[PDB]
Amino acid sequence: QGVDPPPPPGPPSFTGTKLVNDADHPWQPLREGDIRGPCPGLNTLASHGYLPRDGVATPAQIITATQEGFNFENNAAIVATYLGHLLNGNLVTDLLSIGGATPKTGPPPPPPAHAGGLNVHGTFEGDAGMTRADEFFGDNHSFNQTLFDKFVDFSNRYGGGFYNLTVAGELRYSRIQDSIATNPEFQFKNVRFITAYGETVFPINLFVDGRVTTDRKLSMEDAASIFRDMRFPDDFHRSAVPASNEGADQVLAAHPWVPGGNADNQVNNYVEDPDSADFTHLCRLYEFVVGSVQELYPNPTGILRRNLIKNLHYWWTGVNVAFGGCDELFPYGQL
Numbered sequence: 465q466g467v468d469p470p471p472p473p474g475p476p477s478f479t480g481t482k483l484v485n486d487a488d489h490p491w492q493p494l495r496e497g498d499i500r501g502p503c504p505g506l507n508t509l510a511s512h513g514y515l516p517r518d519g520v521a522t523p524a525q526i527i528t529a530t531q532e533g534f535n536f537e538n539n540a541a542i543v544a545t546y547l548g549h550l551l552n553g554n555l556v557t558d559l560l561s562i563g564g565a566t567p568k569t570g571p572p573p574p575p576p577a578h579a580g581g582l583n584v585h586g587t588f589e590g591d592a593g594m595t596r597a598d599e600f601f602g603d604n605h606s607f608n609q610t611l612f613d614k615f616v617d618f619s620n621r622y623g624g625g626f627y628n629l630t631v632a633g634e635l636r637y638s639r640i641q642d643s644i645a646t647n648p649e650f651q652f653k654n655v656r657f658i659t660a661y662g663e664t665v666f667p668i669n670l671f672v673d674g675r676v677t678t679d680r681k682l683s684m685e686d687a688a689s690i691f692r693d694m695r696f697p698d699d700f701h702r703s704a705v706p707a708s709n710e711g712a713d714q715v716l717a718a719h720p721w722v723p724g725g726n727a728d729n730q731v732n733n734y735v736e737d738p739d740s741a742d743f744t745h746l747c748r749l750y751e752f753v754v755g756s757v758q759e760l761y762p763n764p765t766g767i768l769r770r771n772l773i774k775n776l777h778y779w780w781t782g783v784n785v786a787f788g789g790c791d792e793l794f795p796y797g798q799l
């Protein structure tokens with residue numbers, strides 16, 4: 465009949481570097497029913513047992529895993545986790561698939577809500593990723609070797625064979641151009657516009673070993689290990705400080721860009737959206753997402769309503785800090 469969802473964990477007691485690829489967290493191959501998805505971070509944590517190996521977890525487990533495994537900053541973990549859960553998780557059972565649909569999240573919610581996992585396109589997951597192809601081409605979750613080859617190419621061209629912040633600036637823009645030219649349904653606004661810049665620096669701030677203090681750069685072996693094999697590098701030590709999206713500002717500055725999309729189902733037809741969230745208008749993202757939640761849950765009652773209210777509030781606690789102050793919305797009132 466359902467779960468009473470606890471408030472998110474706070475920051476880890478210990479925030480220094482440590483060995484995360486350790487004896488208690490061995491890489492293991494997928495079993496039947498194991499779920500993986502578009503996030504290499506969560507994929508790696510599942511394949512090393514920081515998350516349940518089946519790829520279905522509670523928000524709390526996801527937060528603690530991103531902190532333990534990678535030293536993902538607490539508020540960043542809260543913003544990402546409850547966004548993913550509100551849109552893509554089962555709020556009654558308190559379970560989120562890090563990939564596609566699975567019986568493991570329990571009894572489905574009332575449509576149009578789906579609990580279909582992070583694979584679901586269009587509000588969270590979106591286009592112009594680094595190692596995953598746009599949903600328009602048929603597969604938004606699998607590793608794509610051609611895209612990784614371009615990652616390697618750009619690292620060779622701008623990063624001395626390593627992925628660093630200069631590479632990120634160039635790759636991000638080029639991937640936007642690929643999608644403009646080839647994807648008639650290309651959207652790059654709202655959540656996706658914001659998350660697309662952060663994801664390009666996560667490899668630098670989080671996938672680079674934490675003992676490397678200076679000239680942080682990711683090797684292609686380590687990139688392949690994580691992005692393709694869902695495997696931590698041997699002897700991997702997490703970031704020495706809580707981190708998230710440091711440097712995302714510089715990635716945008718290298719090639720200034722404006723939220724929007726290809727209009728009228730045509731390539732090479734990018735039109736700007738002036739209503740979208742952007743980096744100086746972050747609270748729009750909060751309002752947009754609360755709107756999206758109302759579309760998914762038009763008239764909840766009982767445990768569903770209760771859990772919506774709590775998750776919405778938990779999300780806001782993170783958003784309020786991360787976005788520098790947003791007025792809390794109460795689409796379902798109070799408990």
Ligand SMILES: *[C@@H]1O[C@H](CO)[C@@H](O[C@@H]2O[C@H](CO)[C@@H](O[C@@H]3O[C@H](CO[C@H]4O[C@H](CO[C@H]5O[C@H](CO)[C@@H](O)[C@H](O)[C@@H]5O)[C@@H](O)[C@H](O[C@H]5O[C@H](CO)[C@@H](O)[C@H](O)[C@@H]5O)[C@@H]4O)[C@@H](O)[C@H](O[C@H]4O[C@H](CO)[C@@H](O)[C@H](O)[C@@H]4O)[C@@H]3O)[C@H](O)[C@H]2NC(C)=O)[C@H](O)[C@H]1NC(C)=O
Binds near residue numbers: 623628629630680
């Ligand atoms: C991601 O990874 C990539 C790849 O590793 C990395 O790229 C490095 O980025 C740094 C910058 O952050 C680069 O270093 C800088 O290079 C600048 C450009 O250098 C060229 O021009 C120099 C200036 O020449 C003057 O004089 C000549 C006359 O000789 C004149 O014609 C010119 O017009 C100009 O006026 C030149 O000196 C330099 O050539 C020297 O070095 C090369 C070896 O690379 C050698 O072949 C030459 O014989 C010569 O010895 C080159 O052609 C440069 O301007 C800049 O200099 C500043 O800093 C130094 C030291 O800090 C100061 O002494 C100086 O006053 C300047 O303020 C600096 O050296 C580096 O080259 C990149 N490496 C590669 C491989 O591309 C990214 O940074 C990484 N990103 C992140 C975020 O980490």
Ligand SMILES: *[C@@H]1O[C@H](CO)[C@@H](O[C@@H]2O[C@H](CO)[C@@H](O[C@@H]3O[C@H](CO[C@H]4O[C@H](CO)[C@@H](O)[C@H](O)[C@@H]4O)[C@@H](O)[C@H](O[C@H]4O[C@H](CO)[C@@H](O)[C@H](O)[C@@H]4O)[C@@H]3O)[C@H](O)[C@H]2NC(C)=O)[C@H](O)[C@H]1NC(C)=O
Binds near residue numbers: 598645731
């Ligand atoms: C892994 O991910 C890769 C990269 O995203 C996928 O490959 C892409 O696949 C799409 C769809 O097949 C390709 O899109 C098509 O591009 C054509 C233009 O290609 C030229 O230009 C690009 C660069 O601008 C070059 O890279 C490329 O080699 C060519 O020289 C267009 O003509 C196509 O458009 C037609 O159809 C659309 C849709 O209906 C219409 O709207 C158009 O008007 C038009 O008629 C189309 O967009 C794309 O080029 C591929 N990129 C690369 C780099 O290969 C893989 O599919 C995927 N791998 C697997 C197995 O999943």
Ligand code: HEM
Binds near residue numbers: 502503504527656670
């Ligand atoms: C905290 C909860 C997390 C959630 C809910 C989450 C969710 C997602 C989703 C949905 C995507 C797909 C992006 C898209 O196609 O638009 C994504 C991509 C990504 N995530 Fe995560 N993520 C989380 C944590 C992390 C962590 C801790 C890291 C790094 C350790 C990470 C690294 C990445 C990277 C690099 C990508 C880009 C993949 C690519 O474009 O090839 N994420 N994440």
Ligand SMILES: C/C=C/C(=O)[C@@H]1C(C)=CCCC1(C)C
Binds near residue numbers: 540541660663
């Ligand atoms: C998976 C990525 C999440 C993000 O980039 C977050 C959002 C949604 C906005 C501000 C930055 C950050 C908290 C990292």
Ligand SMILES: [Mg+2]
Binds near residue numbers: 589590597
């Ligand atoms: Mg994507």
